[PDB]
């Protein structure tokens, strides 16, 4: 016998609740910063909406 565990999920389309072990930091605004929002990486300037 073999035990098989199959894990299903969707990525970067909906709000998430699990996440990984990475540790978060503070939010910097009005500056050029690399960001990682719920797994989504990129570069830009963050401003209030």
């Amino acid at each position: 016998p073999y035990r098989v565990v199959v894990l299903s999920f969707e990525l970067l389309h909906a709000p998430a609740t699990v996440c990984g072990p990475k540790k978060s930091t503070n939010l910097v605004k009005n500056k050029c910063v690399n960001f990682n929002f719920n797994g989504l990486t990129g570069t830009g300037v963050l401003t209030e909406s």
């Binding site: 300037v45 401003t47 209030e48 909406s49």
Partner: protein, 49 residues
């Protein structure tokens, strides 16, 4: 008088020339669009930016 320049205008365009200029709508009112002019929600809503 309708095709010669008119000195009463800020430019030196004729009446007919001004009428001609007012009937073509360009997309760039000037050529200096600053970065701070469209920063935030203005982007993805202004076609030029």
């Amino acid at each position: 008088s309708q095709i010669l320049p008119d000195p009463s205008k800020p430019s030196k365009r004729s009446p007919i020339e001004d009428l001609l200029f007012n009937k073509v709508t360009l997309a760039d009112a000037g050529f200096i669009k600053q970065y701070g002019d469209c920063l935030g929600d203005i982007a993805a809503r202004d076609l030029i930016c």
